[PDB]
Amino acid sequence: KDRPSLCDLPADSGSGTKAEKRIYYNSARKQCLRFDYTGQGGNENNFRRTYDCQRTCLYT
């Protein structure tokens, strides 16, 4: 209801060797924002598409 708790998850970049452009819900801005996810060592808050972030975290 409320909000999926995965939206409260930090933007974690991982410490990987690759560079990959992903998007997460920024909790304070209440807006989805792009971060660099590196492909090794990350968090579950990984959206590959902007509507995906929007739909899950905004529709509450």
φ/ψ of 33, rounded to 5, equals: -140, 155
Method: NMR
Topology classification of domain 1-60: Factor Xa Inhibitor (4.10.410)
Q: In this structure, what DSSP letter does residue 57 have?
A: H
Distances (CA, A) of 24 to 2, 18, 35: 17, 18, 7
Rounded to whole angstroms, the Cα distance separating 16 from 5 reads 25
* Residue 58, phi then psi, degrees to nearest 5: -100, -25
